[PDB]
Paper text:
Orange Carotenoid protein (OCP) is the only known photoreceptor which uses carotenoid for its activation. It is found exclusively in cyanobacteria, where it functions to control light-harvesting of the photosynthetic machinery. In the active state, following OCPR (red state) binding to the cyanobacterial light-harvesting antenna, the keto-carotenoid dissipates excess absorbed light energy through non-photochemical quenching (NPQ), a vital process for cyanobacterial survival in turbulent waters.
In contrast to a previous crystallographic investigation of OCP photoactivation, we observe that the absorbance spectra of OCPO in solution and in crystals are nearly identical, thereby providing evidence for the same electronic structure of the carotenoid in both crystals and solution. The data furthermore supports identification of glycerol, acetate, the Cl− ion and 401 water molecules in the crystal structure. The location of Cl− in this study was confirmed by long-wavelength X-ray crystallography. Cl− is resolved in the CTD, where it coordinates four water molecules through ion–dipole interactions at distances of 3.0–3.2 Å (HOH16, HOH23, and HOH46) and 4.0 Å (HOH41). The closest CAN carbon is C12, located at 4.1 Å distance from the Cl− ion in the CTD. Three amino acids (L248, T275, and P276) are within 4 Å distance from Cl−. Tyrosine Y44 and tryptophan W110 are located in closest proximity (4Å) to the C6’-C7’ = C8’-C9’ moiety in the hydrophobic pocket which also contains the β2-ring of the carotenoid. Together with W41, residues Y44 and W110 interact with the carotenoid β2-ring through π-π stacking.
Author numbering: 4 to 315
The structure:
Amino acid sequence: TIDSARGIFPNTLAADVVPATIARFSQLNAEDQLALIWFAYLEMGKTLTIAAPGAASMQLAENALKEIQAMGPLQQTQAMCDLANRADTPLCRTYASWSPNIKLGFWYRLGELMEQGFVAPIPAGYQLSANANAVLATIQGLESGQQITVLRNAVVDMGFTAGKDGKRIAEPVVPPQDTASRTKVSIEGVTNATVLNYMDNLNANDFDTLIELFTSDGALQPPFQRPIVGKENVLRFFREECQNLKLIPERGVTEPAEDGFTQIKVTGKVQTPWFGGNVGMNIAWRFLLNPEGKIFFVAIDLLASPKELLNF
Ligand SMILES: CC1=C(/C=C/C(C)=C/C=C/C(C)=C/C=C/C=C(C)/C=C/C=C(C)/C=C/C2=C(C)C(=O)CCC2(C)C)C(C)(C)CCC1=O
Ligand SMILES: [Cl-]
């Protein structure tokens, strides 16, 4: 089953401090949630610059941003608290319809406006609650790759989803990289063509080729999230959330599994277009391939430390 395949390579130590820290953050008072992330954002910006949101994304968030910018200060603060509290409001429903990148670009803009004083800032001299100060301390002790994953997950969690098949807004799909200019990965130990083609197609934004590597019932499990099952949902996820990554796999190991299956573990690094080469996340991929080589299951794990990379 997909759910049992979740257990392959049980030695892999994932960075479960990330969902732990998100769960602590999610307990906090909404104003402290907003202050804490402001605090973390300012500090992090001393050494790491976030890439600008794409034009399409900004256009899609523009109405909502304008609405907030038109509010009085107290209402601005209430609107941001509504998003953090996951209140059911029109703003919260609009926000929930957005892909992660659009939500991130919305908050990018608000951060700039708060820095400039045009959107109500965190109150001057604000002191975090006892629980919130310790949450921030944990965040600031993590590796940058973990730090940025905590911030993304806090952003994505905000807002209010009412319904099963509500509208989904995402950025337009980029055209795949021309075949001529495509790079090929090299992985120590691993010549498996399905793994190599996985990595190379994702790096080229070639989602239609990538999806064809999977079994019809196959699943992909992103870090700290449940498996996404079947070709339509996995392709959806590629198109909405997996554009412009850079996968830098380094080494792997290849083992038999029950029934002519093969299990392969690869470790390496990943860069998100929000940070480019300044943040390299430590990642493992865990593949379960059927006898024909298609992908029945792949898990992508954020690793606890670089000491989890194979043969560090
Ligand atoms: C919120 C907020 C603010 C602002 C906050 C702001 C502006 C925060 C901005 C935060 C940003 C821009 C975070 C970006 C994170 C991106 C990550 C972790 C991507 C990981 C990708 C991975 C691992 C993908 C890997 C993958 C591989 C390898 C596969 O093989 C398959 C695909 C898959 C995707 C799984 C303010 C500052 C205004 C204060 C108030 C406040 O609350
Ligand atoms: Cl990303």
